[PDB]
Protein backbone atom coordinates (compact mmCIF):
# COMPACT_ATOMS: atom_id res chain seq x y z
CA UNK A 1 0.00 0.00 0.00
CA UNK A 2 1.26 3.47 -0.86
CA UNK A 3 2.49 5.32 2.24
CA UNK A 4 2.96 2.05 4.18
CA UNK A 5 6.01 -0.14 4.87
CA UNK A 6 5.29 -3.72 3.75
CA UNK A 7 7.41 -5.39 6.45
CA UNK A 8 6.19 -3.55 9.56
CA UNK A 9 2.96 -1.89 8.42
CA UNK A 10 4.25 1.39 9.81
CA UNK A 11 4.05 4.28 7.34
CA UNK A 12 6.81 4.33 4.72
CA UNK A 13 9.16 7.24 3.93
CA UNK A 14 6.59 9.16 1.87
CA UNK A 15 4.02 8.30 4.53
CA UNK A 16 6.25 9.90 7.17
CA UNK A 17 6.66 13.07 5.14
CA UNK A 18 2.92 13.45 4.60
CA UNK A 19 2.12 12.61 8.23
CA UNK A 20 4.56 15.29 9.42
CA UNK A 21 2.95 17.86 7.13
CA UNK A 22 -0.58 16.87 8.21
CA UNK A 23 0.33 16.75 11.91
CA UNK A 24 1.92 20.20 11.82
CA UNK A 25 -1.04 21.58 9.87
CA UNK A 26 -3.42 20.03 12.41
CA UNK A 27 -1.50 21.50 15.34
CA UNK A 28 -1.62 24.94 13.72
CA UNK A 29 -5.26 24.69 12.62
CA UNK A 30 -6.80 22.70 15.49
CA UNK A 31 -4.50 23.91 18.24
CA UNK A 32 -3.44 20.36 19.08
CA UNK A 33 -0.03 19.83 20.71
CA UNK A 34 2.44 17.75 18.72
CA UNK A 35 5.73 16.07 19.54
CA UNK A 36 7.92 14.51 16.85
CA UNK A 37 10.40 11.72 17.60
CA UNK A 38 13.24 10.44 15.41
CA UNK A 39 14.52 6.98 16.36
CA UNK A 40 17.53 4.99 15.16
CA UNK A 41 18.31 1.45 16.33
CA UNK A 42 21.72 0.87 17.92
CA UNK A 43 22.06 -2.92 17.87
CA UNK A 44 20.07 -4.38 14.96
CA UNK A 45 23.16 -5.38 12.99
CA UNK A 46 24.55 -7.48 15.87
CA UNK A 47 21.10 -9.03 16.35
CA UNK A 48 21.14 -9.97 12.65
CA UNK A 49 24.64 -11.42 12.89
CA UNK A 50 23.85 -13.39 16.05
CA UNK A 51 20.36 -14.70 15.23
CA UNK A 52 19.86 -14.10 11.51
CA UNK A 53 18.07 -11.36 9.58
CA UNK A 54 14.67 -13.00 10.01
CA UNK A 55 15.09 -12.49 13.75
CA UNK A 56 15.98 -8.89 12.96
CA UNK A 57 12.85 -8.51 10.84
CA UNK A 58 10.79 -9.78 13.78
CA UNK A 59 12.41 -7.18 16.02
CA UNK A 60 11.34 -4.38 13.68
CA UNK A 61 7.82 -5.79 13.43
CA UNK A 62 7.64 -5.99 17.24
CA UNK A 63 8.83 -2.38 17.51
CA UNK A 64 6.01 -1.13 15.31
CA UNK A 65 3.28 -3.45 16.64
CA UNK A 66 4.04 -2.48 20.23
CA UNK A 67 4.06 1.21 19.26
CA UNK A 68 0.59 0.84 17.73
CA UNK A 69 -0.19 -0.52 21.18
CA UNK A 70 -0.07 2.92 22.83
CA UNK A 71 -0.32 5.40 19.94
CA UNK A 72 -3.62 7.30 19.72
CA UNK A 73 -6.07 7.79 16.85
CA UNK A 74 -4.26 10.82 15.42
CA UNK A 75 -0.79 9.56 16.36
CA UNK A 76 1.49 7.65 14.01
CA UNK A 77 4.68 5.71 13.42
CA UNK A 78 6.57 5.56 10.16
CA UNK A 79 9.72 3.89 8.88
CA UNK A 80 12.07 6.52 7.48
CA UNK A 81 14.09 3.68 6.00
CA UNK A 82 16.42 0.93 7.17
CA UNK A 83 16.33 0.80 10.99
CA UNK A 84 15.27 4.43 11.40
CA UNK A 85 11.74 5.41 12.45
CA UNK A 86 9.68 8.53 13.16
CA UNK A 87 6.87 8.80 15.69
CA UNK A 88 4.30 11.57 15.85
CA UNK A 89 2.34 12.05 19.07
CA UNK A 90 -0.44 14.58 19.53
CA UNK A 91 -0.08 15.14 23.27
CA UNK A 92 1.87 17.28 25.74
CA UNK A 93 5.63 16.77 25.83
CA UNK A 94 5.20 15.42 29.38
CA UNK A 95 2.75 12.71 28.31
CA UNK A 96 4.37 11.88 24.98
CA UNK A 97 7.86 11.57 26.44
CA UNK A 98 6.80 9.51 29.45
CA UNK A 99 4.98 6.97 27.27
CA UNK A 100 7.79 6.78 24.70
CA UNK A 101 10.42 6.24 27.40
CA UNK A 102 8.40 3.51 29.12
CA UNK A 103 7.89 1.86 25.73
CA UNK A 104 11.59 1.98 24.87
CA UNK A 105 12.43 0.64 28.33
CA UNK A 106 10.10 -2.29 27.70
CA UNK A 107 11.86 -3.02 24.41
CA UNK A 108 15.23 -3.30 26.15
CA UNK A 109 13.90 -6.59 27.52
CA UNK A 110 13.06 -11.60 23.00
CA UNK A 111 16.21 -9.98 21.59
CA UNK A 112 16.76 -6.71 23.53
CA UNK A 113 16.45 -3.62 21.35
CA UNK A 114 18.64 -0.54 21.93
CA UNK A 115 17.46 2.80 20.53
CA UNK A 116 18.87 6.33 20.14
CA UNK A 117 16.08 8.91 20.01
CA UNK A 118 15.53 12.64 19.71
CA UNK A 119 12.41 14.76 20.18
CA UNK A 120 11.15 18.20 19.17
CA UNK A 121 7.95 20.02 20.12
CA UNK A 122 5.72 21.66 17.51
CA UNK A 123 5.35 25.40 18.02
CA UNK A 124 3.31 28.08 16.26
CA UNK A 125 5.09 29.39 13.18
CA UNK A 126 7.28 26.35 12.52
CA UNK A 127 7.11 24.14 9.43
CA UNK A 128 7.50 20.36 9.20
CA UNK A 129 11.02 20.56 7.77
CA UNK A 130 12.30 22.64 10.70
CA UNK A 131 10.58 20.44 13.29
CA UNK A 132 12.18 17.40 11.65
CA UNK A 133 15.60 19.07 11.65
CA UNK A 134 15.32 19.68 15.40
CA UNK A 135 14.22 16.16 16.33
CA UNK A 136 16.82 14.71 13.95
CA UNK A 137 19.65 16.76 15.48
CA UNK A 138 18.60 15.67 18.98
CA UNK A 139 18.68 12.02 17.89
CA UNK A 140 22.30 12.35 16.78
CA UNK A 141 23.22 13.82 20.16
CA UNK A 142 21.65 10.75 21.76
CA UNK A 143 23.42 8.48 19.28
CA UNK A 144 26.93 9.86 19.73
CA UNK A 145 26.72 10.05 23.51
CA UNK A 146 26.28 6.28 23.58
CA UNK A 147 22.76 5.46 22.44
CA UNK A 148 19.99 3.78 24.44
CA UNK A 149 18.60 7.19 25.31
CA UNK A 150 16.22 9.96 24.30
CA UNK A 151 17.61 13.48 24.05
CA UNK A 152 15.16 16.39 23.88
CA UNK A 153 15.62 19.39 21.61
CA UNK B 154 25.06 -6.72 -20.07
CA UNK B 155 23.28 -8.85 -17.48
CA UNK B 156 26.07 -8.64 -14.89
CA UNK B 157 26.46 -4.88 -15.17
CA UNK B 158 22.78 -4.33 -14.37
CA UNK B 159 23.02 -6.92 -11.61
CA UNK B 160 26.29 -5.77 -10.04
CA UNK B 161 26.46 -2.00 -10.44
CA UNK B 162 24.79 0.96 -8.74
CA UNK B 163 23.06 2.99 -11.47
CA UNK B 164 23.53 6.41 -9.85
CA UNK B 165 27.26 6.24 -9.04
CA UNK B 166 28.58 3.48 -11.31
CA UNK B 167 30.25 1.86 -8.31
CA UNK B 168 29.31 -1.76 -7.61
CA UNK B 169 25.96 -2.17 -5.83
CA UNK B 170 25.53 -4.29 -2.69
CA UNK B 171 25.38 -7.58 -4.62
CA UNK B 172 28.57 -6.48 -6.37
CA UNK B 173 30.28 -5.61 -3.07
CA UNK B 174 29.55 -9.07 -1.73
CA UNK B 175 30.82 -10.81 -4.86
CA UNK B 176 33.87 -8.53 -5.07
CA UNK B 177 34.75 -9.26 -1.44
CA UNK B 178 34.38 -12.99 -2.06
CA UNK B 179 36.57 -12.91 -5.17
CA UNK B 180 39.21 -10.67 -3.56
CA UNK B 181 39.54 -12.93 -0.52
CA UNK B 182 39.77 -16.02 -2.73
CA UNK B 183 42.50 -14.45 -4.84
CA UNK B 184 44.32 -13.48 -1.64
CA UNK B 185 44.01 -16.94 -0.07
CA UNK B 186 44.81 -18.76 -3.31
CA UNK B 187 46.79 -16.50 -5.65
CA UNK B 188 48.54 -15.02 -2.65
CA UNK B 189 48.32 -11.31 -3.40
CA UNK B 190 47.60 -8.69 -0.70
CA UNK B 191 44.12 -7.35 -0.05
CA UNK B 192 42.86 -4.52 2.13
CA UNK B 193 39.15 -3.84 2.67
CA UNK B 194 37.83 -0.40 3.60
CA UNK B 195 34.35 0.48 4.87
CA UNK B 196 33.44 4.16 4.46
CA UNK B 197 30.48 6.18 5.73
CA UNK B 198 29.93 9.86 4.95
CA UNK B 199 29.57 12.31 7.86
CA UNK B 200 28.07 15.40 6.20
CA UNK B 201 25.91 14.55 3.18
CA UNK B 202 22.55 15.43 4.76
CA UNK B 203 23.23 19.15 5.26
CA UNK B 204 24.24 19.31 1.58
CA UNK B 205 20.86 17.92 0.48
CA UNK B 206 19.02 20.26 2.86
CA UNK B 207 20.35 23.47 1.35
CA UNK B 208 21.17 22.45 -2.24
CA UNK B 209 18.64 19.72 -3.03
CA UNK B 210 18.97 15.97 -3.65
CA UNK B 211 20.33 16.44 -7.17
CA UNK B 212 23.29 18.26 -5.61
CA UNK B 213 23.74 15.50 -3.06
CA UNK B 214 23.55 12.93 -5.87
CA UNK B 215 26.39 14.78 -7.58
CA UNK B 216 28.45 14.50 -4.37
CA UNK B 217 28.09 10.70 -4.41
CA UNK B 218 28.88 10.63 -8.12
CA UNK B 219 32.07 12.68 -7.65
CA UNK B 220 33.17 10.51 -4.73
CA UNK B 221 33.09 7.36 -6.86
CA UNK B 222 34.42 9.19 -9.92
CA UNK B 223 37.50 10.39 -8.02
CA UNK B 224 38.03 6.91 -6.56
CA UNK B 225 38.22 5.35 -10.03
CA UNK B 226 40.93 7.95 -10.59
CA UNK B 227 43.44 6.10 -8.41
CA UNK B 228 42.06 2.58 -8.02
CA UNK B 229 44.09 -0.19 -9.60
CA UNK B 230 42.94 -2.47 -12.42
CA UNK B 231 42.09 -5.18 -9.88
CA UNK B 232 40.84 -2.88 -7.12
CA UNK B 233 37.20 -1.89 -6.71
CA UNK B 234 34.68 0.45 -5.15
CA UNK B 235 31.12 -0.48 -4.26
CA UNK B 236 28.11 1.21 -2.73
CA UNK B 237 26.78 -0.76 0.24
CA UNK B 238 23.76 1.52 0.14
CA UNK B 239 22.85 5.11 1.01
CA UNK B 240 26.05 7.05 1.69
CA UNK B 241 28.05 3.96 2.70
CA UNK B 242 30.79 2.52 0.45
CA UNK B 243 33.33 -0.31 0.40
CA UNK B 244 36.71 -0.16 -1.33
CA UNK B 245 38.87 -3.18 -2.08
CA UNK B 246 42.56 -2.58 -2.72
CA UNK B 247 44.93 -5.34 -3.80
CA UNK B 248 48.15 -3.81 -2.47
CA UNK B 249 50.11 -3.75 0.79
CA UNK B 250 48.37 -2.07 3.73
CA UNK B 251 50.80 0.87 3.76
CA UNK B 252 50.27 1.66 0.09
CA UNK B 253 46.50 1.14 0.25
CA UNK B 254 46.08 3.21 3.42
CA UNK B 255 48.31 6.05 2.24
CA UNK B 256 46.44 6.25 -1.06
CA UNK B 257 43.08 6.30 0.73
CA UNK B 258 43.98 9.06 3.21
CA UNK B 259 45.48 11.16 0.42
CA UNK B 260 42.22 10.78 -1.50
CA UNK B 261 40.02 11.65 1.50
CA UNK B 262 42.19 14.68 2.26
CA UNK B 263 41.61 15.87 -1.29
CA UNK B 264 37.84 15.54 -0.85
CA UNK B 265 37.90 17.37 2.49
CA UNK B 266 32.71 21.99 -4.73
CA UNK B 267 31.33 21.03 -1.31
CA UNK B 268 33.87 19.37 1.04
CA UNK B 269 33.29 15.74 2.01
CA UNK B 270 33.81 14.38 5.52
CA UNK B 271 34.24 10.62 5.82
CA UNK B 272 34.60 8.02 8.58
CA UNK B 273 36.65 5.01 7.48
CA UNK B 274 37.72 1.63 8.81
CA UNK B 275 40.17 -0.89 7.37
CA UNK B 276 41.05 -4.58 7.75
CA UNK B 277 43.76 -6.66 6.08
CA UNK B 278 43.19 -10.14 4.66
CA UNK B 279 45.22 -12.89 6.32
CA UNK B 280 45.17 -16.69 6.21
CA UNK B 281 42.34 -18.19 8.24
CA UNK B 282 40.16 -15.12 7.74
CA UNK B 283 37.13 -15.26 5.44
CA UNK B 284 35.23 -12.42 3.74
CA UNK B 285 32.45 -12.15 6.32
CA UNK B 286 35.06 -11.88 9.08
CA UNK B 287 37.16 -9.39 7.10
CA UNK B 288 34.03 -7.28 6.60
CA UNK B 289 33.18 -7.43 10.31
CA UNK B 290 36.66 -6.18 11.19
CA UNK B 291 36.61 -3.29 8.72
CA UNK B 292 33.03 -2.39 9.68
CA UNK B 293 33.86 -2.29 13.39
CA UNK B 294 36.88 -0.13 12.60
CA UNK B 295 34.70 2.32 10.66
CA UNK B 296 32.34 2.61 13.65
CA UNK B 297 35.27 3.44 15.92
CA UNK B 298 36.30 6.21 13.52
CA UNK B 299 32.73 7.50 13.36
CA UNK B 300 32.28 7.71 17.13
CA UNK B 301 35.70 9.28 17.66
CA UNK B 302 34.72 12.35 15.66
CA UNK B 303 34.74 11.07 12.10
CA UNK B 304 36.86 12.51 9.29
CA UNK B 305 39.46 9.81 9.94
CA UNK B 306 40.55 6.25 9.23
CA UNK B 307 40.82 3.61 11.96
CA UNK B 308 42.47 0.24 11.30
CA UNK B 309 41.38 -3.14 12.67
Ligand SMILES: Nc1nc2c(ncn2[C@@H]2O[C@@H]3COP(=O)(O)O[C@H]4[C@@H](O)[C@H](n5cnc6c(=O)[nH]c(N)nc65)O[C@@H]4COP(=O)(O)O[C@H]3[C@H]2O)c(=O)[nH]1
Nearest residue numbers: 080081082083084201202205210211212213214238239240
Ligand atom coordinates in the same frame (compact mmCIF):
# COMPACT_ATOMS: atom_id res chain seq x y z
N1 LIG C 1 17.70 0.85 3.79
C1 LIG C 1 17.26 2.11 3.65
N2 LIG C 1 17.56 3.02 4.64
C2 LIG C 1 17.13 4.32 4.55
C3 LIG C 1 16.35 4.74 3.38
N3 LIG C 1 16.06 6.03 3.54
C4 LIG C 1 16.60 6.41 4.72
N4 LIG C 1 17.24 5.38 5.32
C5 LIG C 1 17.93 5.41 6.63
O1 LIG C 1 17.80 6.70 7.20
C6 LIG C 1 19.02 7.39 7.33
C7 LIG C 1 18.96 8.89 7.06
O2 LIG C 1 18.36 9.06 5.76
P1 LIG C 1 18.18 10.51 5.17
O3 LIG C 1 17.45 11.31 6.20
O4 LIG C 1 17.54 10.46 3.80
O5 LIG C 1 19.65 11.20 5.06
C8 LIG C 1 20.50 10.60 4.06
C9 LIG C 1 20.57 11.38 2.79
O6 LIG C 1 20.43 12.78 3.10
C10 LIG C 1 21.93 11.08 2.17
N5 LIG C 1 21.79 10.12 1.04
C11 LIG C 1 21.86 8.77 1.07
N6 LIG C 1 21.69 8.24 -0.16
C12 LIG C 1 21.51 9.26 -1.01
C13 LIG C 1 21.28 9.45 -2.47
O7 LIG C 1 21.20 8.47 -3.26
N7 LIG C 1 21.14 10.71 -2.95
C14 LIG C 1 21.21 11.82 -2.15
N8 LIG C 1 21.06 13.05 -2.70
N9 LIG C 1 21.43 11.72 -0.80
C15 LIG C 1 21.58 10.49 -0.20
O8 LIG C 1 22.74 10.58 3.25
C16 LIG C 1 21.97 10.60 4.49
C17 LIG C 1 22.29 9.48 5.45
O9 LIG C 1 22.16 8.22 4.79
P2 LIG C 1 22.41 6.91 5.63
O10 LIG C 1 23.73 6.99 6.31
O11 LIG C 1 22.26 5.71 4.75
O12 LIG C 1 21.35 6.82 6.84
C18 LIG C 1 19.99 6.68 6.39
C19 LIG C 1 19.44 5.29 6.42
O13 LIG C 1 20.06 4.58 7.50
C20 LIG C 1 16.07 3.71 2.35
O14 LIG C 1 15.40 4.00 1.32
N10 LIG C 1 16.54 2.46 2.55
Ligand SMILES: Nc1nc2c(ncn2[C@@H]2O[C@@H]3COP(=O)(O)O[C@H]4[C@@H](O)[C@H](n5cnc6c(=O)[nH]c(N)nc65)O[C@@H]4COP(=O)(O)O[C@H]3[C@H]2O)c(=O)[nH]1
Nearest residue numbers: 044045048053054056057081082083084237238239240241
Ligand atom coordinates in the same frame (compact mmCIF):
# COMPACT_ATOMS: atom_id res chain seq x y z
N1 LIG D 1 19.33 3.88 1.34
C1 LIG D 1 19.87 2.66 1.55
N2 LIG D 1 20.89 2.53 2.47
C2 LIG D 1 21.47 1.32 2.71
C3 LIG D 1 20.98 0.13 1.99
N3 LIG D 1 21.70 -0.91 2.40
C4 LIG D 1 22.59 -0.44 3.30
N4 LIG D 1 22.45 0.89 3.49
C5 LIG D 1 23.26 1.74 4.40
O1 LIG D 1 24.26 0.95 5.04
C6 LIG D 1 24.11 0.88 6.44
C7 LIG D 1 24.42 -0.47 7.08
O2 LIG D 1 23.58 -1.44 6.42
P1 LIG D 1 23.63 -2.96 6.86
O3 LIG D 1 25.08 -3.36 6.80
O4 LIG D 1 22.69 -3.80 6.04
O5 LIG D 1 23.21 -3.07 8.42
C8 LIG D 1 21.83 -2.79 8.70
C9 LIG D 1 21.00 -4.01 8.98
O6 LIG D 1 21.83 -4.97 9.66
C10 LIG D 1 19.85 -3.54 9.85
N5 LIG D 1 18.61 -3.43 9.04
C11 LIG D 1 18.15 -2.37 8.34
N6 LIG D 1 16.98 -2.66 7.72
C12 LIG D 1 16.67 -3.93 8.04
C13 LIG D 1 15.58 -4.89 7.74
O7 LIG D 1 14.61 -4.58 7.02
N7 LIG D 1 15.64 -6.14 8.28
C14 LIG D 1 16.68 -6.54 9.08
N8 LIG D 1 16.69 -7.80 9.58
N9 LIG D 1 17.71 -5.70 9.39
C15 LIG D 1 17.76 -4.42 8.90
O8 LIG D 1 20.27 -2.29 10.41
C16 LIG D 1 21.63 -2.00 9.99
C17 LIG D 1 21.93 -0.54 9.86
O9 LIG D 1 20.97 0.09 9.01
P2 LIG D 1 21.13 1.63 8.71
O10 LIG D 1 21.20 2.37 10.00
O11 LIG D 1 20.02 2.08 7.82
O12 LIG D 1 22.55 1.90 8.01
C18 LIG D 1 22.67 1.31 6.71
C19 LIG D 1 22.42 2.23 5.56
O13 LIG D 1 22.80 3.56 5.95
C20 LIG D 1 19.87 0.34 1.02
O14 LIG D 1 19.41 -0.63 0.36
N10 LIG D 1 19.38 1.60 0.86
Ligand SMILES: [Mg+2]
Nearest residue numbers: 040041083084
Ligand atom coordinates in the same frame (compact mmCIF):
# COMPACT_ATOMS: atom_id res chain seq x y z
MG1 LIG E 1 20.22 3.40 11.44
Ligand SMILES: [Mg+2]
Nearest residue numbers: 197198240241
Ligand atom coordinates in the same frame (compact mmCIF):
# COMPACT_ATOMS: atom_id res chain seq x y z
MG1 LIG F 1 25.68 6.54 6.38
